[PDB]
Write a protein that binds this DNA or RNA. Structure first.
Ligand SMILES: [Mg+2]
Ligand SMILES: [Mg+2]
Ligand SMILES: [Mg+2]
Ligand SMILES: [Mg+2]
Ligand SMILES: [Mg+2]
Ligand SMILES: [Mg+2]
Ligand SMILES: [Mg+2]
Ligand SMILES: [Mg+2]
Ligand SMILES: [Mg+2]
Lengths: 261, 180, 188
RNA sequence: CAGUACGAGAGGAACCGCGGGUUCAGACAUUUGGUUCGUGCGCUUGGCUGAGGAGCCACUGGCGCGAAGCCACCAUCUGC
RNA sequence: UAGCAGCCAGCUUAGAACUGUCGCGGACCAGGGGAAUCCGACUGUU
RNA sequence: UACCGAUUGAGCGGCUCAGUGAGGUCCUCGGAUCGCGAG
RNA sequence: CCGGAGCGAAAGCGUUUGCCAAGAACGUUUUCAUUAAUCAAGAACGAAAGUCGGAGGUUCGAAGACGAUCAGAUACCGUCG
RNA sequence: UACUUUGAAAAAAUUAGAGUGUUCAAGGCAGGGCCCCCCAUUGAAUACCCCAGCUAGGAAUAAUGGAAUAGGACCCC
RNA sequence: UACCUGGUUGAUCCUGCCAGUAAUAUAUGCUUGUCUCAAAGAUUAAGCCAUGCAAGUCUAAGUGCACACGAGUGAAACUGCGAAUGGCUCAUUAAAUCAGUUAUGGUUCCUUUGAUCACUUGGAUAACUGUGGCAAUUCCAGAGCUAAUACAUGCGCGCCGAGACGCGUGCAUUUAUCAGUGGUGACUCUAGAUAACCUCGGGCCGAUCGCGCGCCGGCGGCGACGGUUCAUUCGAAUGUCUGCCCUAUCAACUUUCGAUGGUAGGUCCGUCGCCUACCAUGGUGACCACGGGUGACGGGGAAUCAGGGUUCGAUUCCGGAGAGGGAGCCUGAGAAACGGCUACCACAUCCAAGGAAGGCAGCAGGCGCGCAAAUUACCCAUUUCCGACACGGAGAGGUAGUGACGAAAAAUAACAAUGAAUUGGAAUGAGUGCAUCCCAAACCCAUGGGCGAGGACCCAUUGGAGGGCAAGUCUGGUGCCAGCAGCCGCGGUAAUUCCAGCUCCAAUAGCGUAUGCUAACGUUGCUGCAGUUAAAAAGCUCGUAGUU
């Protein structure tokens, strides 16, 4: 190519978007934003395929242009905005607040939260830049730059920031025993506490996470998102938090539910 | 680039021996006994059995208590008992290798409507299915190869608009009544 | 035009390779600046990404630094005397990086005579300050000989073809002794 | 003249008039071209006069251009 | 001690800039070449 | 049906020696023209 | 004498005697301690016939000549070579 | 360090395969149940993805190194 | 389904091939009633192209003094932003592309996200007006005006010395010096400081537009847009490791003229012989370098397979490459762009013969080439993209048309007495109109009711009937003729094999044939073949790589 591409084929779209095959050739390429193209969820998918408030892409354009949708407190009018992990979607017309959290599987969820919980979010620190005049900065996973942070915040910890003020209210120290959520790599959606952090100098550090039912697993350091201090989460966990019931365990759960329904 | 899938698989396979006398007799015997149209419907139901036997034969290779064998094995067994081709008494992975092509041919729609007394013969059974006469649970079926399952066994009856059941007469019944 | 690609080179085994594509634009090269010594003439060229480079075509003044002391004064360049790449750049008086030049020394003797109050190129509270500085005021004999002629032997540490400034430092210590024998071997 | 006479066609002339040419003959140098030891002008190789300047020698040193003469259906003019 | 200082001595080679009217083994000196046939092998001799 | 065959056999392509070299791009200076500068 | 005997990697090797170097097997409570097996492109040897330069040339004998034989016989046979 | 086992990581589509009566099927990824909603966390799994690279165990098999002209390993100090 | 059968002989047992058999590719012969899905000018020609079209783009919010108008509605133009995406084709390209892997602490990045940073100046110009030239062009020139978010101007520490000032407002930029705020396996990192530098072809501190009037000349409400330096995001370039087919009738190749490396520099966004200069004499190769061939784009994949394999992959997804052949550059964040430009080459168009203009391997369509491949159709409603934008545009795409490339379902009858174009009443389709549904309008399917079958004339073909191989010691014709036959053979006047009639067999809306390809084939044998006599162990021995 001679420059940046602007289209996205539907079959080449991420599998977790749950897009069909015979509806169209192109998929909505998520516009540039805080979250990556492969690790986000466009606003058009969330309103048409998840909430089903709009049946076409033109209706999503009318919904967003009336200044109804607002991500992280700021009103958005881009139907292809990359709404990612821990982002808050507020609909003041219906009084609904959504937070994009992964399923028990590797897919996003329609997880409705309350108004008091929609006032904040969780952001994972990526780097700590020392700007001019020795002013430290915090680079979160959503490109948010926060000046003058708590000196105890490190390169892999999470912080609880407000959406209206934009400042840090509290934070969770990244260490063993704290609750964490996997953000990719065959464990997307599993929730558990940290048990061991293997350090490989010169390559990726793999940590070991153990869920509540004891099914320990592992993943790289770049996929762990601390969501709670110890065993208590700071955000509302989705139904089916991180158990990851096997295909055999889910079958018995479905059959016993159909007989009871 | 179009929004199509281009997926399509065949349902039968031609034998290696084209004029094997021992094969032509047993295939023609299946056609007349079940009222089939051609040899393709015989090779299709043989190819259907071959896929199930090959799927079970792969599971017999895997050892017991295997998460893949227990899941896919129980799913295949309950799927065969659902359509009625496999009994509930002995549902094991080794009894799938003891299935015959006649077991599937007995679960067709033309043979079930014949066994239920709704049709005179097996050939009379196929002609009324294609003429929108019988249904299954308020659903009119026009296909004789409808694989009836056990949940829809006691729901096969004539449609609510056919003269055989309760409905208006045919085009030739009132035609003869008008002329005389 | 001028290309910096490597698909026109032979492989390490010695066999010729065929080109995979035409000359791309992100592989372009531009002619040398050939910064001569004269009135300041600097042409600006647009480069990849919208940035700007400064092609210094002619330069006469340069901000040179002093090593032993801390004296970085904008001084005039007289002529070049040595070049490690080839002596053909010394004839044309081309200002490049790491080339030994003869820079003017009036601001350096001006600063030295204003800081230590001692000839170089020839209140009670205030006097105490200068006496403390005269304790460490000896200059290497290789530099004092240069201040008598008004020409200091400097070295350009900047890239005038890229930034447009012929900045550098004054040669001192073992580095000065190295380039002296290189010039005297040529002059002899 | 003429596509006419002539001829079923296919084909197809001639006189008057007009414009050129072939061969030959007699001239001629405005023009083009050839020659140029007016050894005219410039340049140049080797050598020589101590050098510059100015010049010479190598049976016309060589090269570029070239006047005047002479010259070519290789230019032009005339031929009852 | 990865040898230096002083002094002396010629004659060749390579590269580069500039320059004259693209002229430069400038006179002089100084092989035209290729494809084949016949005869004698060649140098020499008459 | 291939092969040898005088005919410097003939034709059609690929990559190149040398010469000639259009047209851009930079570098030196060149100032029609316009109001010391832009050109 | 001379053999379903010996030796040699094969080709090949048979009178006596001497000289030179080499070899298998056997014998060993000697020594080294894996140094081995088979091996592209390479290399030695290699019947008879044939080629080149000398010596030699009894027999035999390609070619060739001749005498037979035959329908023919430049073949088989014979005499010279 | 080869082998072996585990983990990490991996574009989908395709293949295998779970669920689901497009009238059946090829297929699709949807759709089922009750009298303006609610329940079935409605579903939209999972497996495979050589070799090489990365990681954590095993130490059989096959290579490989260690002390011999010793200052070789531990002490002394 | 881990399969075999005919053919060497008088007969036999073998090696062996030829022939048969079954999928899959295109092409073709004959044939065809429903319904669904779907490939489709790749193979020869990266051959040539008439014509139309395919990229344009306003918000309450950069300019807007013509129309039509009670300010607004609307045009042209300028300033923006796009046109570097998409689409198409497979010519080139054998460690190249590409696929995993991995780095950029060897780089740049428009847009998107978050950090940061005078009560109003000056001169032009388009549209417009008007005089015009040329045979002609998205051709321009002369003159007269007028706007900007256009184009340019502008409001504590270190020195000094009686511990009172001056310079650095600050961040960028460039060089030099030195003390070790927060990180990293690992900065010559990021921040502190000093000395100055700071490009006139000078880096930035809003001379900007909105809807709104609320109050004490002054302070205020909410938005749009633009710039600097750092994050991000979409990336893009250049590297790391491993992996490609055939060929030795290619065994040495590279290195004047960069081949391998060193040093200094130039250049680039940045690393690098990327280039230059000076030195060193290296680098690759029997584990196949180098050269040649490819009817070679690579891969995800596809066909066929008991296990191993063999073959295919122009083709909708990813990456790369190229727009007739090469080369050069402009603009821009991004191009060595060709639905941009400038040259030469080939081809070709108009012409007052002076000149002008061109690139369908984009969507339709034409020609040519061939065994071989469709409509000069409809709409931006779905899918998405672009733009000053909820409104515009889009042959990208979607929907129809052509279509036996193929895949799924599935009619051509069913039911009763009588000894069959006999009889008898029933049963829904094909078709045909009419409503509804469908769909941007249409079309197709589906739901109803009205017509609609007795040779239910609303007729099923395509190859065979000696063997292999299911199926006539039939009848007539021909007489080694004509013809059949994949193979063995048949036809020599009583042909089960030819030409036909009748009959029968096989598959069936299909089926035959031709050429590739796979299994047959343990006739390429790694699994898994052979070398006494059927094709076969070098005459023998030594000998390195290799293997063990
Ligand atoms: Mg006539
Ligand atoms: Mg003359
Ligand atoms: Mg002279
Ligand atoms: Mg003389
Ligand atoms: Mg002479
Ligand atoms: Mg002359
Ligand atoms: Mg001859
Ligand atoms: Mg002759
Ligand atoms: Mg002679």
């Amino acid at each position: 190519a001679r420059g940046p591409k602007k289209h996205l084929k539907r079959v080449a779209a991420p599998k977790h978007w749950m897009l069909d095959k015979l509806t169209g050739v192109f998929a909505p390429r998520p516009s540039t934003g805080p979250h990556k193209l492969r690790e986000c969820l466009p606003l058009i998918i969330f309103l048409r395929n998840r909430l089903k408030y709009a049946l076409t892409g033109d209706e999503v354009k009318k919904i967003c242009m009336q200044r109804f949708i607002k991500i992280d407190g700021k009103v958005r009018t881009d139907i292809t905005y990359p709404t990612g992990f821990m982002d808050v979607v507020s609909i003041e017309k219906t009084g609904e607040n959504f937070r994009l959290i992964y399923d028990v599987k590797g897919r996003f969820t329609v997880h409705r939260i309350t108004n008091e919980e929609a006032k904040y979010k969780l952001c994972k620190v990526r780097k700590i830049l020392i700007g001019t005049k020795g002013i430290p900065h915090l680079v979160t996973h959503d490109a948010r730059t926060i000046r003058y942070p708590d000196p105890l915040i490190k390169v892999n910890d999470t912080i609880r920031i407000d959406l209206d003020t934009g400042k840090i209210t509290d934070f969770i120290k990244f260490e063993t025993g704290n609750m964490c959520m996997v953000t990719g790599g065959a464990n997307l959606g599993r929730i558990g506490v940290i048990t061991n952090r293997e350090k490989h100098p010169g390559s990726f550090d793999v940590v070991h996470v153990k869920d509540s039912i004891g099914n320990s697993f592992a993943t790289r350091l770049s996929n762990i998102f601390v969501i709670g201090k110890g065993n208590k989460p700071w955000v509302s966990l989705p139904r089916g938090k991180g158990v990851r019931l096997t295909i055999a365990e889910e079958r018995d759960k479905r059959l016993a539910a159909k007989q009871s329904s | 680039p179009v929004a199509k899938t281009w997926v399509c698989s065949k349902t039968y396979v031609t034998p290696r021996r084209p004029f094997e006398k021992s094969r032509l007799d047993q295939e023609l015997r299946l056609i007349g006994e079940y009222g089939l149209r051609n040899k393709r419907e015989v090779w299709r139901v043989k190819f259907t059995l071959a896929k199930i036997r090959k799927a079970a034969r792969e599971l017999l290779t895997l050892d017991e208590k295997d998460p893949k064998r227990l899941f896919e094995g129980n799913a295949l067994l309950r799927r065969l008992v659902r359509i009625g081709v496999l009994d509930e008494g002995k549902m094991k992975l080794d009894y799938i290798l003891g299935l015959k092509v006649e077991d599937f041919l007995e679960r067709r729609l033309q043979t079930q409507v014949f066994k239920l007394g709704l049709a005179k013969s097996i050939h009379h059974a196929r002609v009324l299915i294609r003429q929108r006469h019988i249904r299954v649970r308020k659903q009119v079926v026009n296909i004789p190869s409808f694989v009836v399952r056990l949940d829809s066994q006691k729901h096969i009856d004539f449609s609510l608009r056919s003269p055989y059941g309760g409905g208006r007469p045919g085009r030739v019944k009132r035609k003869n009544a008008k002329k005389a | 035009g001028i290309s910096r690609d490597n698909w026109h080179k032979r492989r390490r085994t010695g066999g010729k390779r065929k080109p995979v594509h035409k000359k791309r634009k992100y592989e372009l090269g531009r002619p040398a600046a050939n910064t001569k010594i004269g009135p300041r003439r600097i042409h600006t060229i647009r480069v990849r990404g919208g940035n700007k480079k400064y092609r210094a075509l002619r330069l006469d003044v340069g901000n040179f630094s002093w090593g032993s002391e801390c004296c970085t004064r904008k001084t005039r360049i007289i002529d070049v005397v040595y070049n490690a790449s080839n002596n053909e750049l010394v004839r044309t008086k081309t200002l490049v990086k790491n080339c030994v030049v003869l820079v003017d020394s009036t601001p350096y003797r001006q600063w030295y005579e204003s800081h230590y109050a001692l000839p170089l190129g020839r209140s009670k509270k205030v006097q105490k300050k200068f006496t403390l500085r005269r304790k460490t005021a000896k200059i290497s004999p290789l530099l004092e000989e240069q201040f008598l002629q008004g020409k200091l032997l400097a070295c350009i540490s900047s890239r005038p073809g890229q930034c447009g400034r012929a900045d550098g430092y004054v040669l001192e210590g073992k580095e000065l002794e190295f380039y002296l024998r290189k010039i005297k071997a040529k002059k002899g």
